[PDB]
From a paper:
The m1G37 modification also prevents the ribosome from shifting out of the three-nucleotide [name] codon frame (‘frameshifting’) to ensure the correct polypeptide is expressed. The absence of m1G37 in tRNAPro causes high levels of +1 frameshifting on so-called ‘slippery’ or polynucleotide [name] sequences where four nucleotides encode for a single proline codon. To address this question, here we solved six 70S structures of tRNAPro-CGG in the presence or absence of the m1G37 modification and bound to either cognate or slippery codons in the P site. We further show that ribosomes bound to [name]-[name] pairs that result in +1 frameshifts promoted by tRNAPro-CGG result in large conformational changes of the 30S head domain, consequently biasing the [name]-[name] pair toward the E site.
We next asked how ASLPro interacts in the P site with a CCC-U codon, a slippery codon known to facilitate +1 frameshifts. In this X-ray structure solved to a resolution of 3.4 Å, we find two different conformations of the codon–anticodon interaction in the two molecules of the crystallographic asymmetric unit. In the first ribosome molecule, nucleotides G36 and G35 of ASLPro form Watson–Crick base-pairs with the first two nucleotides of the 0-frame [name] codon. A mismatch C+3•C34 forms at the third base-pair position of the codon–anticodon interaction and contains a single hydrogen bond between the Watson–Crick face of C+3 (the N3 position) and C34 (the N4 position). The codon–anticodon interaction is in the 0 frame as indicated by the clear phosphate density of the next [name] nucleotide, U+4. Strikingly, in the other ribosome molecule in the crystallographic asymmetric unit, the codon–anticodon interaction is in the +1 frame. The first two nucleotides of the anticodon (G36-G35) form Watson–Crick base-pairs with C+2-C+3 nucleotides of the [name] codon, respectively. At the third position of the codon–anticodon interaction, a cis-Watson–Crick U+4•C34 pair forms that contains a single hydrogen bond between the Watson–Crick face of U+4 (the O4 position) and C34 (the N4 position). The absence of electron density for the next nucleotide in the [name] confirms the +1 frame of the codon–anticodon interaction as this is the last nucleotide of the [name]. Therefore, although the m1G37 modification is present in ASLPro, the shift in the +1 frame can still occur.
Numbering used by the authors:
A (entry chain RD): 2 to 273
B (entry chain R7): 1 to 47
Write the structure that this text describes.
RNA sequence: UGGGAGAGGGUGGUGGAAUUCCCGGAGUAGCGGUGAAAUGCGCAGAUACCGGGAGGAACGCCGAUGGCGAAGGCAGCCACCUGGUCCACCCGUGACGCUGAGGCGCGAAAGCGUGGGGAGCAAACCGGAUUAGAUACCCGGGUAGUCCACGCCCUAAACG
RNA sequence: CGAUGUCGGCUCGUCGCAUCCUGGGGCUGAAGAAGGUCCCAAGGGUUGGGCUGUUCGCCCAUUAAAGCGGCACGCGAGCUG
RNA sequence: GAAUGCCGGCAUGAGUAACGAUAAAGAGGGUGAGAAUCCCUCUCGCCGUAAGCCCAAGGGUUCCUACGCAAUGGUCGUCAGCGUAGGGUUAGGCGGGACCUAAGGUGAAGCCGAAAGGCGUAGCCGAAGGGCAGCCGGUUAAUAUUCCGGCCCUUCCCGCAGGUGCGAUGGGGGGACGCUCUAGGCUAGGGGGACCGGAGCCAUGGACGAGCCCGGCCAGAAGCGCAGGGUGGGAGGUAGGCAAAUCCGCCUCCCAACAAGCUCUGCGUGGUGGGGAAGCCCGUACGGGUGACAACCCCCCGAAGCCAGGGAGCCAAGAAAAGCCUCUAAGCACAACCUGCGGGAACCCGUACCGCAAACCGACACAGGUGGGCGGGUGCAAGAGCACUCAGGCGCGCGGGAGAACCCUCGCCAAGGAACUCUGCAAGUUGGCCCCGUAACUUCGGGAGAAGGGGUGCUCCCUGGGGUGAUGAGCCCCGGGGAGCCGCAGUGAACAGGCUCUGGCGACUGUUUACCAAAAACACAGCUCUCUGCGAACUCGUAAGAGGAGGUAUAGGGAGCGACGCUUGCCCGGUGCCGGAAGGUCAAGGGGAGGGGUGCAAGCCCCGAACCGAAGCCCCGGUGAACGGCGGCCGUAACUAUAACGGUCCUAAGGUAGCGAAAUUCCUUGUCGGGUAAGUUCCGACCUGCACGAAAAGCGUAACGACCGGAGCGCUGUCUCGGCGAGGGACCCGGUGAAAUUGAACUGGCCGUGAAGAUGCGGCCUACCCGUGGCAGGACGAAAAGACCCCGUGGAGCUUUACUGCAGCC
RNA sequence: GAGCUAGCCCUGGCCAGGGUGAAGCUGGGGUGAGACCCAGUGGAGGCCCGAACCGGUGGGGGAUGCAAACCCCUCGGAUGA
RNA sequence: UGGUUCGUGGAGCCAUGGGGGAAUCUGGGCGGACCACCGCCUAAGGCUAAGUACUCCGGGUGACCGAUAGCGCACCAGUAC
């Protein structure tokens, strides 16, 4: 629903921000925040391991419930929908009838005021979490555990959704957001709805700096490098790739698969 | 212009000083060499 | 006021046949294709058969010189929302009417922008035949597109 | 090669003559005027511009003429670059 | 006797360059053995968002005083930041620790590693962050928020008095937070004043005057007042805050909707405490007395500071823990806690001095570098700008003369204006504010300060708005109209764009080669390809572990292109990558046909053929925004010319669109046209593209550009073509006094000669001895064991289908 | 050895004064309802002019220097990568 | 795989990281692949002086030096810098 800009500077010609229309509460719940360690790419050795990170806006981390079999049977009233900086989705503030407050991430089509509940016996209705063995086949669904009681791994980004295409025995068959078809165990919880903020991927950042506010630093091509630095480096003049196109560490980056071949997960994976 | 030696009594003691020699097995051999030399200051004098 | 018909339109949902692909079984020396052949597919087990699964598009019989709409145009079924129209009763208002330069809206198909989707067909493109030659007609592949949402384009043998 | 700084421009000259002009002369297919060619002759003079890093060259407008070469293709402990 | 040899010593250059900002000096008087340089007075100049105060870092005695001058001071020195000696730094309230946590470090539990060691939850350490109780003056030669004076506070510990279930390192609240823009009321700060208090002064033509000059404050408990911040109050129900809770959280009705009530700050007032100018008189270097019984009043401007956790908006969504409050748990409830009072107790370290600099970092009393706060006044529209100047601090630790060339930094110029030159390089024109007015083009924002104009000072009169005060005077902020005055000139000084047309590259702001390159290179939003289903892929690591990520296909990695507009054609034969349970080949291992060596034999020990044996390669397909590639020869059309057309060779295919003598064009200054008097550059065309061409992208593109090219207008010392003037050097004198270089030197020209470029050889010529200011032709001048070339079976960096290995992967 | 320098993490600070005037609000116009168009308010931006601050474009000086990167004139950014 | 003179060699012996895996005197290793004969030792637990190496320190001696030599230092030196 994505809010655009008159071209009164050169960067504001193309820059789009999101609407923030579903946001009801501008300031996060005090008992559910804890500080993000900004890391900068830098591991415990101090070395860069992911290049070109840092410089971001400071963030407080919002504790998300990715389990929701913690609190089976206890319904919750949706009290607020909020901005999480740490993820593409929005988040929903739940006041449970206990008075435990939790965040969950926000489906498409939540309203404030409404009631959600996890359950094998919850209604099949947006925001409720069931095992996958109890959701009817053909529903779209999100927040999907991959192995049971290990918490939600699958379909967490903004707009994303997985669909149940079958059962087979203990296991159910998911169309993942990649289009991968995968056997997931039936007792893995999953949370119905697709995820909201589906207009995330139409955001055009507009200028250089809005990359830097998110902690994405400048990315340097290997053709601008020198042959110690990169395979693509060097060449008096500009340079075609000269060789099959290649990472800084030597391996190819047009086509080369590196799914590990003897992985035990591949017996659970149908297509790709 | 801004030259190289910009002194700091925190940094001098925490880097070159005696308690940070004796963490490292290289740094204990520093004081061993300076004792065997006979130096009057095994560590840099900070105050 | 009381009724009637209709693919009139918008939204949500849903049913079956068939094409393609994938998986399993069985099964052989050929299948497609044409005027005829060839490209092509096939002993790495194709076509032809059965069973399961996924996906998209269009809805056979009803069905026609039929209906509906101002035009473009509209066809499985279900529900919601909604426009037009016709008949009867002759009840009310009481000339309130006709057309309409501009304006405003709608406007097949092709085309364009963002995202999705892509089974079949199919510009461009690639082969194989015809021919003196083929940038075509015929044949085998095949990308945009054809589909959806939103925004444009504003055309025609938009014809009675 | 335990270093002789390379092109072009500027500044500053100085030298040679196989002379562009000026001076003297022979022959002329030299009527006159203007020329051609050769001999003597360096004392002096030998312009300002457009283009190009240019030297050279091509044009513009003049001129009596718009000379060719040497001096480490003179001259960077003189300058530019 | 040589090694550009090592160490030391002393010479040459040479009384030469220089003496470290062109902010500036002159005189009188003292001390002294000795004064331009030390102290005092007068005159002059310089800084004054500092070149003036206060913090922090760093430095470590440099502070003050007394006595000195060998060395240090770029001269001198009686002076000093120097030598000797003595003195000086006082804290419950300032900073830090017996408080807390952040990144990080360490690290019992635990994980890993040949050893050394590497990780790691809780914990602990870790500070310009959070927490916490002191303001104003006075004394010293030198310390003070530290001592003294006044006023006011915080912790403990022990007592009594009155209240309450008290009670944890445990639960909860709070602490607690972004950027930008702001309202109200204050304070700091400043301006004015006829009012108040002052020593005094009428000068030189006038003035005894609401004259001139100086000053009209500071802190301050309780209690009021004015601003403002935080906050709902009961009742039940309760399974969540890992035990328990009356607390918190979540429901359900009742009264508020407000700050009404509670607290809590800020600011005024406040008992009382203190300060108190100019001028004059002095005896120090620095200070004192008087002026004073001082006055200590009123207006205006007003903050970026306070109320503070204020309000509004926005996306990029903005630390933790303790102090503090509350709630229970054991234990206790003769306790323990809270409020009031009294008595008592309150440790360790720093404190001097410099601190945009002569005391820090630069070997130096070095024109460089160094974080935070105050930083007055007037005018210029505003300002931390600029000019002058309060307080305050300086005249930069060599001077005196002279008035050449030459150099640096300035000023001016006849006539001409780019003729200079690689280039208007440099320098000049323009310059601030107000009002007219402003083109192509465009992404409708811009282009725009387009361009080009007019106004600009002062006096008098009339006149409209606000803010503070009562609607009023005054004080302040803004305007309008009319009439005049002066000068060459009115932003009268200083600070303050030259403009336009056109092309190339890159969309734009940005980034880089610290110390010769700021660009068309890098980056950039944006496009595509590819990988990656999560103990992800990728990366660091032997491992453990960690980043990715406390992310989950709208996410993460890798590669290329690089906003946007219109587009990205053909070749999959070779290389890469992807898909193929067939087939060829393929190692260990299985398998033993058969044979061998020894034994008197049972035996023991060897080879060893079929056949079964993975990945990989061969093979079959796919794949270009993967690596890459994208032709040649003949003939033909009613005049030549040309070839729409055809024939033919080869290829995997034979360059499509769009550009094109281009950042690409050798021939080349191609050829036409435009500009010019004249144009190897420029702009527009043709295509004969040596050798453009579609994501190492193609062709365009408004705006942007300290990028690169061409042209014109204005303007000028760039030039014709120079001239004059100013200052800092240069020159002379006094003081101090280097350097690279140097075989020794008694060191001329020509023509020859010589290892082929002679002061030194030969012949001739010329020439008394020695300096100073200058110029650079030579001494193959100095400096660097040439960096271009070659050599060395010299070395490093980089590449690959060179060789051979290794990590990694299968 | 990261007290220079490059990147990142934690915690603080700094950016005088002027211009332009996006969204959004309010009134009005408009329509069946709208889109939309006027004003007024508003105060956005890797916006503009320019000190501190960060740089280092062109020229000149310097060249055994004040300086082993300096000085003068000029110039770029200056609410943000 | 390492050690030994042993660099795969006819490669034994000794120690081993991986796989298989006995016996207790009629049992086992060895004498350089292997076999026979003849011989030599008794693994898979550990301790053990002296003879050997060095010179921070004390002493003796020198066809060793004599302040550019001898230690870096004869001297308040691992100091000043
Ligand atoms: Mg928290
Ligand atoms: Mg760590
Ligand atoms: Mg470490
Ligand atoms: Mg890049
Ligand atoms: Mg490069
Ligand atoms: Mg490197
Ligand atoms: Mg490489
Ligand atoms: Mg390359
Ligand atoms: Mg090239
Ligand atoms: Mg009737
Ligand atoms: Mg009538
Ligand atoms: Mg249409
Ligand atoms: Mg269509
Ligand atoms: Mg489309
Ligand atoms: Mg087809
Ligand atoms: Mg076809
Ligand atoms: Mg018709
Ligand atoms: Mg040479
Ligand atoms: Mg020499
Ligand atoms: Mg002659
Ligand atoms: Mg003559
Ligand atoms: Mg003659
Ligand atoms: Mg003649
Ligand atoms: Mg004649
Ligand atoms: Mg010209
Ligand atoms: Mg030129
Ligand atoms: Mg030449
Ligand atoms: Mg000549
Ligand atoms: Mg020559
Ligand atoms: Mg020459
Ligand atoms: Mg030259
Ligand atoms: Mg140059
Ligand atoms: Mg050059
Ligand atoms: Mg000799
Ligand atoms: Mg010698
Ligand atoms: Mg010497
Ligand atoms: Mg001398
Ligand atoms: Mg002299
Ligand atoms: Mg001399
Ligand atoms: Mg001299
Ligand atoms: Mg001198
Ligand atoms: Mg005397
Ligand atoms: Mg400090
Ligand atoms: Mg200190
Ligand atoms: Mg010092
Ligand atoms: Mg001292
Ligand atoms: Mg004295
Ligand atoms: Mg002295
Ligand atoms: Mg003495
Ligand atoms: Mg002296
Ligand atoms: Mg000195
Ligand atoms: Mg004396
Ligand atoms: Mg002193
Ligand atoms: Mg002293
Ligand atoms: Mg203690
Ligand atoms: Mg204690
Ligand atoms: Mg502590
Ligand atoms: Mg702690
Ligand atoms: Mg550790
Ligand atoms: Mg250990
Ligand atoms: Mg830790
Ligand atoms: Mg602190
Ligand atoms: Mg603090
Ligand atoms: Mg304190
Ligand atoms: Mg005081
Ligand atoms: Mg003092
Ligand atoms: Mg006191
Ligand atoms: Mg209690
Ligand atoms: Mg807490
Ligand atoms: Mg707590
Ligand atoms: Mg005041
Ligand atoms: Mg008076
Ligand atoms: Mg008088
Ligand atoms: Mg006053
Ligand atoms: Mg006051
Ligand atoms: Mg007061
Ligand atoms: Mg309540
Ligand atoms: Mg409980
Ligand atoms: Mg209120
Ligand atoms: Mg009070
Ligand atoms: Mg007084
Ligand atoms: Mg006085
Ligand atoms: Mg607030
Ligand atoms: Mg703690
Ligand atoms: Mg002190
Ligand atoms: Mg002090
Ligand atoms: Mg300062
Ligand atoms: Mg110094
Ligand atoms: Mg230095
Ligand atoms: Mg010093
Ligand atoms: Mg000095
Ligand atoms: Mg200095
Ligand atoms: Mg400076
Ligand atoms: Mg500074
Ligand atoms: Mg001020
Ligand atoms: Mg001022
Ligand atoms: Mg004035
Ligand atoms: Mg002012
Ligand atoms: Mg101004
Ligand atoms: Mg200020
Ligand atoms: Mg100033
Ligand atoms: Mg003064
Ligand atoms: Mg001086
Ligand atoms: Mg004059
Ligand atoms: Mg002139
Ligand atoms: Mg003139
Ligand atoms: Mg002119
Ligand atoms: Mg010229
Ligand atoms: Mg010329
Ligand atoms: Mg030019
Ligand atoms: Mg210029
Ligand atoms: Mg002017
Ligand atoms: Mg233009
Ligand atoms: Mg405009
Ligand atoms: Mg103007
Ligand atoms: Mg006047
Ligand atoms: Mg006021
Ligand atoms: Mg008023
Ligand atoms: Mg005038
Ligand atoms: Mg000016
Ligand atoms: Mg060009
Ligand atoms: Mg750029
Ligand atoms: Mg472009
Ligand atoms: Mg700009
Ligand atoms: Mg830029
Ligand atoms: Mg550089
Ligand atoms: Mg360098
Ligand atoms: Mg530069
Ligand atoms: Mg693009
Ligand atoms: Mg897109
Ligand atoms: Mg590794
Ligand atoms: Mg991990
Ligand atoms: Mg994590
Ligand atoms: Mg991706
Ligand atoms: Mg990516
Ligand atoms: Mg590129
Ligand atoms: Mg490009
Ligand atoms: Mg366009
Ligand atoms: Mg292509
Ligand atoms: Mg290919
Ligand atoms: Mg291929
Ligand atoms: Mg192929
Ligand atoms: Mg393969
Ligand atoms: Mg074998
Ligand atoms: Mg075998
Ligand atoms: Mg075998
Ligand atoms: Mg195989
Ligand atoms: Mg012909
Ligand atoms: Mg042909
Ligand atoms: Mg083509
Ligand atoms: Mg041309
Ligand atoms: Mg012409
Ligand atoms: Mg012409
Ligand atoms: Mg021409
Ligand atoms: Mg052209
Ligand atoms: Mg051409
Ligand atoms: Mg070319
Ligand atoms: Mg190209
Ligand atoms: Mg190319
Ligand atoms: Mg390409
Ligand atoms: Mg282009
Ligand atoms: Mg352009
Ligand atoms: Mg341009
Ligand atoms: Mg001149
Ligand atoms: Mg002169
Ligand atoms: Mg002068
Ligand atoms: Mg002298
Ligand atoms: Mg000679
Ligand atoms: Mg001679
Ligand atoms: Mg001789
Ligand atoms: Mg001389
Ligand atoms: Mg000379
Ligand atoms: Mg000279
Ligand atoms: Mg020379
Ligand atoms: Mg030389
Ligand atoms: Mg050499
Ligand atoms: Mg070099
Ligand atoms: Mg060789
Ligand atoms: Mg070699
Ligand atoms: Mg390996
Ligand atoms: Mg650093
Ligand atoms: Mg400002
Ligand atoms: Mg508006
Ligand atoms: Mg603004
Ligand atoms: Mg800006
Ligand atoms: Mg600026
Ligand atoms: Mg400041
Ligand atoms: Mg700096
Ligand atoms: Mg830089
Ligand atoms: Mg510069
Ligand atoms: Mg320079
Ligand atoms: Mg500037
Ligand atoms: Mg500018
Ligand atoms: Mg061996
Ligand atoms: Mg061996
Ligand atoms: Mg061998
Ligand atoms: Mg061996
Ligand atoms: Mg073993
Ligand atoms: Mg073993
Ligand atoms: Mg054996
Ligand atoms: Mg043996
Ligand atoms: Mg044996
Ligand atoms: Mg034997
Ligand atoms: Mg034996
Ligand atoms: Mg034994
Ligand atoms: Mg001894
Ligand atoms: Mg001797
Ligand atoms: Mg010695
Ligand atoms: Mg001696
Ligand atoms: Mg020695």
């Amino acid at each position: 629903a994505v809010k655009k800009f008159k071209p009164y500077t050169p960067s504001r010609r193309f820059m789009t921000v999101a609407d923030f229309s579903e946001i009801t509460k501008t300031e996060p719940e005090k008992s559910l925040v804890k500080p993000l360690k900004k890391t900068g790419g830098r591991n415990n050795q101090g070395r860069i391991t992911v290049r070109f990170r840092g410089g971001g806006h400071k963030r407080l981390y919002r504790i998300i419930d990715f389990k929701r079999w913690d609190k089976v049977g206890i319904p919750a009233k949706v009290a607020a929908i909020e901005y999480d900086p740490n993820r593409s989705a929005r988040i929903a503030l739940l006041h449970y009838v206990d008075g435990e407050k939790r965040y969950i991430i926000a489906p498409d089509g939540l309203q404030v005021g409404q009631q959600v509940v996890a359950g094998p016996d919850a209604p099949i209705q947006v925001g409720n979490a069931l095992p996958l063995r109890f959701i009817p086949v053909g529903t779209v669904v999100h927040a999907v555990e991959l192995e049971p009681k290990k918490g939600a791994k699958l379909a967490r980004a903004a707009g994303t959704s997985a669909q149940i295409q079958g059962r087979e025995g203990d296991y159910v068959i998911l169309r993942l957001p990649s289009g991968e078809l995968r056997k997931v165990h039936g007792e893995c919880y999953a949370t119905v709805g697709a995820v909201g903020n589906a207009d995330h991927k139409n955001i055009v950042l507009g200028k250089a700096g809005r990359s830097r506010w998110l902690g994405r630093r400048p990315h340097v091509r290997g053709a601008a490098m020198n042959p110690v630095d990169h395979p693509h480096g060097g060449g008096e003049g500009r340079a075609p790739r000269g060789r099959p196109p290649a990472s800084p560490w030597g391996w190819q980056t047009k086509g080369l698969k590196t799914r590990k071949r003897r992985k035990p997960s591949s017996r659970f994976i149908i297509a790709r | 212009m801004k030259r190289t030696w910009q002194p700091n009594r925190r940094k001098r003691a925490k880097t070159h000083g005696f308690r940070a020699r004796m963490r490292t097995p290289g740094g204990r051999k520093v004081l061993k060499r300076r004792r065997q030399k006979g130096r009057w200051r095994l560590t840099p004098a900070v105050r």
